[PDB]
Paper text:
Ribonucleotide reductases (RNRs) catalyze the conversion of ribonucleotides to deoxyribonucleotides, a conserved reaction that is fundamental to DNA-based life. Nearly all aerobic organisms use class I RNRs, which consist of two subunits: α, which contains the catalytic site, and β, which houses a subclass-dependent metal center. Contrary to all other class Ib RNRs studied to-date, the sole RNR of [name] displays class Ia-like activity regulation. We find that [name] RNR has arrived at a remarkably similar solution to the ATP-cone through the evolution of two unique allosteric sites that modulate catalytic activity by inducing contrasting quaternary interactions that either enable or prevent the full range of motions needed for RNR activity.
In support of this, we screened 27 diffraction-quality crystals grown with various combinations of ATP, [name], GDP, and CDP, and only those grown with GDP displayed electron density at the M-site. For example, no density was observed at this site in a 2.95 Å structure of the S-dimer obtained with CDP instead of GDP in the crystallization condition. However, the absence of nucleotide in the M-site of our 2.95 Å S-dimer structure suggests that ATP’s activating effect is primarily exerted by displacement of deoxyribonucleotides at the I-site. Conversely, the primary activating effect of ATP is to destabilize the I-dimer interface by displacing deoxyribonucleotides at the I-site. As ATP has a low affinity for the S-site, the combination of a specificity effector at the S-site and ATP at the I-site favors S-dimer formation.
Numbering used by the authors:
A (entry chain B): 7 to 237, 246 to 685, 694 to 700
B (entry chain A): 8 to 269, 275 to 603, 610 to 685, 694 to 700
């Protein structure tokens, strides 16, 4: 092939440097000589849209809200910008993973600008003017909806626009069977399911009269394992659950094969009491949760372990087991070193700053440890009896492109317009066969707006990832994202005239959420960073006082608004570095069918090679500082992968773990998440 | 000590075994042990109050009787000084049935106590019927099934039925529900058999996407883990079964999950209609079908259509997808797999439905864990969460067996079957199982019971009759004809007493009269004079009697959709001092504890011929002769010698099929035995 030959000329050194400028000709040799030759061209858009509608690719019910004169302008608004892919891989990933091919998969029916216009039309819901705003937002590459939303919007044979779910499992056979079903019902829809197993009683607990008969959390994982294989799942366990060790032992590569679940990623929920016990090397006790329920009438998973730990240890009716917390903490380091996960969640770093503890304290997370929301377990009763439908969690995700948002000075416009997009995706998803998910989506209206291209933007403006100026930039940037996200949530609250259920008891309504912003200023401390926000207003401490009073009068429409998820193949389309993380490689080498493909990180030039420092060469404690400073202005979580070298002892890894907990990190794991990325 | 007396049976003296030494061993078991470990009470009231106050017995059923009556019923049980004739007969009762204390260190319940509580539970307040129930069980004329006999009248009660049959529809919603129902029933200690014949095969379409289904095998693996999770909370009872019609495309992959060199704890059954046998006999190629392509074409499930009428049409319809296989190879494959695993249970579907009375409800499509219950069923449709489901008809097995020997000793064929039918009817009306809607609906609508029999070989050998003789079949033909006669009569008597009939009875062959064509034209009085003399003092119904019963049923209807089925007899066969079910005995003495067959002496040693020495073709003749008068099925285990080729095994299958055998397999079923 020809376009491959031009891309590989990057590695052919000329004058002592790589031929980065050879990728522009490789992507040019890709649009010519292939994809332009394989687009079944139409004479007019009307001929184009009618074929796509008559032959049943696009849904008809949403084009029916627009007059055709408007649809042509929206499509004209997309091509109006002469958009050119800067890299070969950036166009390769779109026209192979996103563009709509024909049913016989031999012709390209959709190009960029087509996907964007259809998506924009779907978002606007009939508003021709907003559909053009959505086009410009995505064609300037300021905002990028998640893969399930970007790919499946407006199509027939629709995959759900949500592809990430969190379930609560109650402690009964009835609830386990339902959780098995809901997992398959959601898995077939292309979504990832993460289940909290901490309310299930441990191995060797009682079943009514018989005293030693429960198979524990492990047995339910084997049921869930087969269920996901039939139709990527995850299971979180609180670290004080007795089965925590057997929970971790199903993921050793050397597992007994008869107990090894193979399609379940695992997560571990750790409250502060465990960190304190590990720090002082004294013996710790894990508990049989049903003895807690039998005694206190409440789920151990719903009580404050920081207040109840000593009481459980001293209650003789509570059954306990002695463990070594340092050995268990080192063990979490090895399994993460061996599988990337268990995803670690510092439970009290989430709820210290949680706005909706009146609904519930956050108890677990999703497949990549970014979604952190309240939840209430259901109780699916017998057949003839009514069930109690609680609140599960749905992940409506999307990320801004930090680079292009700064180039266009559109922090307010992009965040507020993206919020409308996520709110529309939430109101259009109506999932059946998963009742607690469905009830929670209409009641909580939670969205997850993220960001990407932090490292690419910093390296393209002469700023190092580990530098104090970088942290100073992120501190101001995400403070503005949080500002306008809250502002848009309150603006939507008055337009619609309602708030998310039980908002009256949130810290948004009581004002506690704004204590930090009305007392502390977040304008950049370095003048070099201040010059980056030229031409756009930095909200002052007086602005936050005004927003707090405005929210106090009209309320919030969303219970949760921001979360920073990983960016899968779409990061290539956006010509962006992955998520808010540092880059792993300056140039990537991938083997796609008898051909070597090279993709230098976006914007990588010979004059910024120093600034594209690879993550494995970085100080992970300084990386923790960066993620902690961003988490200050993210109400949910941030997917954080530690990039570790092989030559690190178990004391070095726990020192990084303990440090992250100290700085207030909510979630962490090392470096399956396909359904739950942007 | 009592073991030393029992083992003295095998110390041969005078050239023979010491069979009368078991009489002394059982005496040495009641003294020096169980009397030393039986909680003595001063009065019956002190006993009954302790058992009720300390929450062993339920109070709500003893509250229907005045204590003067309860004392009389208990007095009626001890009135017959009942003694176990063998050591094992009492050993199995006081270890598997008698109610021990909560700490398992003392025996709170003896025989006559268990019999009376069960009898009191059955009669539901009728003191006089409670005495009839006592006499019936203390004479050992009838024996309720293990789940009914063990758990009756207790607190923290286990279900009186422990055997279920499920239909599975072809959707994810229905598979999830079937997974749940299997676990919901297994935790209750029951065995559940699921019909998988409506599930689409591997490589069929899921809506738009082509070649995307995992087939029945993937559903078997989900059910497999489901039974392993819910094992009755530590009772080692992960007993499930899965049936597949042989014309299902996945039939080969279905059988391959049970090869030792491969899912475990899932028994399999194969439903074979006449068309498949015909194709194999004439060495013609056979076609298996993708069931969903049949559904898309004809709107009906392939499992609900007549393959003998539709086969050629299926083969010719180009919109129906088929696959060619060798039926001769598949029969040999069924022969070896049965020889190595006991199952696949084989069901000759057309031998079941030829004589089925309720084909208007459905043709029988599968069976239970041991191939005895054969009843109509209708698939449910478990829809989405916010939509209402459609509840079809599953199957429940309320089992019980009469003791053929003692029924002949008491000349009580009519009294026992009618009274046992009353007991099984009460079990059906007191079982209200939640988490299994179609099971619950069908039990109230169909009211199907399964009365069996045991001690057929033990009775024949104690009257100088060989199992393989024509006189044995002549006895079996006449005896079970009477069971079927008085069972139908009692079923019609209850229909008139209660004034109602089982749902859609009006369209059964009982109502149209076709059911009685054989009995009103052909006589079933014994042909051999030796056999006729055994029924002295008892009336053998003539063709004129059947005419009267047929007209009586036509006016009052039938209360039970199904009445008779001969299930295996588990550990309770020891308590009844009886040979297992209607099968021949496998060994004269079992092995350390030794148990000689009931009544086995040196003067009838010839008649206690061991089953592996018998001609299985003659055994088929015996089972075919009984099946004439059983409306459901008979659990039939072939007893095969090692020196039998896979071609020898197929000859037995085809013969049994020709002779009208309904179900067959080689030689677990614990939840579905009596
Ligand atoms: C969802 C799913 C179904 N199946 C099987 C199980 C059922 O036997 C069969 C029917 O599934 P259904 O749940 O009925 O699927 P559907 O109703 O969306 O589509 P259709 O119009 O074809 O009915 O497909 C799988 O094998 N894997 C799967 O992931
Ligand atoms: C039925 C059953 C349950 N379990 C486990 C799953 C659940 O986590 C736990 C609770 O089962 P449950 O369905 O709640 O049992 P129960 O309600 O009859 O009794 P209890 O009053 O104790 O709730 O037991 C098994 O491990 N094996 C089994 O067979
Ligand atoms: N970098 C690019 N990104 C996207 N499409 C491109 C690119 N370069 C060329 N094309 C495709 O080729 C067409 C124009 O071809 P070409 O002569 O290479 O470029 P231009 O006319 O912009 O100078 C565009 O309309 C588009 O379909
Ligand atoms: N074979 C047996 N079957 C049943 N009960 C027996 C048997 N042997 C002994 N018993 C029990 O042990 C008690 C003691 O028996 P024993 O005194 O020898 O005979 P009996 O009471 O008939 O004169 C009996 O009353 C009975 O409760
Ligand atoms: Mg419970
Ligand atoms: Mg369907």
């Amino acid at each position: 092939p020809k376009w491959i030959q031009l891309n590989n000329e990057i590695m052919i050194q000329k004058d002592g440097k790589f031929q980065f400028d050879k990728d522009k000709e490789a992507v040019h040799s890709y649009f010519v000589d292939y994809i332009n030759q394989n687009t079944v061209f139409f004479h007019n858009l009307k001929e184009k849209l009618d074929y796509l509608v008559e032959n049943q690719y696009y849904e008809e019910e949403f084009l029916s809200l627009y007059s055709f004169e408007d649809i042509k302008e929206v499509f004209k608004t997309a091509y109006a910008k002469k958009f050119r892919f800067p890299s070969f891989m950036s166009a390769f990933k779109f026209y192979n993973d996103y563009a709509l091919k024909t049913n016989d998969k031999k012709k390209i029916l959709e190009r960029y600008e087509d996907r964007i216009s259809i998506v924009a039309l779907f978002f606007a819901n009939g508003d021709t003017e907003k559909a053009k705003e959505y086009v410009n937002l995505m064609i300037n590459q300021e905002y990028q909806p998640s893969t399930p939303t970007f790919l499946n919007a407006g199509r027939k044979r629709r995959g759900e626009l949500v592809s990430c779910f969190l379930l609560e499992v109650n402690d009964s056979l009835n609830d386990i069977s339902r959780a098995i079903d809901i997992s398959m019902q959601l898995s077939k829809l292309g979504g990832g399911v993460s289940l909290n197993l901490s309310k299930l009683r441990a191995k060797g607990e009682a079943i009514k009269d018989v005293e030693n008969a429960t198979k524990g959390v492990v047995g339910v994982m084997k049921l869930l394992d087969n269920a996901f294989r039939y139709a990527s799942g995850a299971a979180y366990l609180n670290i004080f659950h007795r089965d925590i060790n057997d929970f971790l032992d199903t993921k050793k590569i050397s597992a007994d094969e008869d107990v090894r679940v193979k399609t379940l990623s695992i997560g571990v929920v750790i409250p502060d009491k465990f960190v304190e016990l590990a720090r002082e090397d004294k013996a710790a006790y894990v508990f049989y949760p049903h003895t807690i329920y039998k005694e206190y009438g409440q789920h151990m998973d719903e009580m404050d372990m920081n207040e109840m730990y000593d009481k459980f240890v001293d209650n003789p009716r509570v059954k306990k087991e002695k463990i070594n917390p340092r050995k268990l903490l080192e063990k979490l380091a090895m399994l993460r070193s061996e599988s990337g996960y268990p995803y670690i969640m510092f439970q009290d770093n989430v709820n210290k700053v949680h706005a909706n503890n009146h609904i519930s304290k956050v108890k677990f997370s999703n497949l990549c440890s970014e979604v952190l929301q309240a939840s209430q377990v259901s109780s699916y009763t017998d057949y003839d009896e009514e069930d109690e439908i609680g609140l599960d969690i749905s992940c409506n995700l999307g990320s801004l492109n930090i680079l292009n948002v700064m180039e266009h000075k559109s922090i307010e416009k992009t965040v507020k317009l993206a919020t409308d997009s996520l709110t529309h995706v939430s109101e259009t998803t109506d999932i059946r066969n998963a009742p607690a998910v469905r009830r929670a989506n209409k009641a909580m209206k939670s969205i997850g707006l993220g960001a990407m291209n932090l490292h690419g933007y910093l390296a393209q403006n002469g700023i190092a990832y580990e530098s104090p100026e970088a942290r100073d930039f992120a501190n101001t940037f995400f403070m503005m994202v949080n500002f306008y996200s809250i502002q848009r949530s309150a603006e939507i609250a008055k337009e619609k005239g309602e708030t998310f259920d039980q908002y009256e008891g949130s810290t948004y309504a009581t004002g506690e959420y704004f204590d930090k912003y009305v007392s502390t200023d977040f304008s950049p401390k370095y003048e070099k960073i201040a010059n980056l926000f030229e031409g756009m207003h930095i909200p002052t401490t007086e602005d936050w006082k005004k927003l707090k009073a405005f929210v106090a009068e009209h309320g919030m429409y969303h219970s949760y608004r921001l979360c920073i998820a990983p960016t899968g193949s779409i990061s290539y389309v956006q010509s962006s570095t992955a998520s808010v993380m540092p880059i792993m490689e300056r140039i990537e080498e991938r083997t796609y069918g008898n051909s070597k493909t090279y993709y230098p990180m976006p914007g990588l030039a010979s004059n910024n090679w120093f600034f594209y420092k690879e993550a494995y060469d970085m100080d992970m404690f300084k990386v923790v500082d960066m993620i902690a400073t961003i988490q200050q202005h993210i109400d949910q979580g941030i997917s954080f992968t530690l990039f570790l070298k092989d030559t690190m002892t178990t004391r070095d890894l726990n020192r990084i773990d303990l440090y992250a907990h100290h700085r207030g990190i909510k979630t962490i794991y090392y470096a399956s998440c396909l359904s739950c990325v942007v």
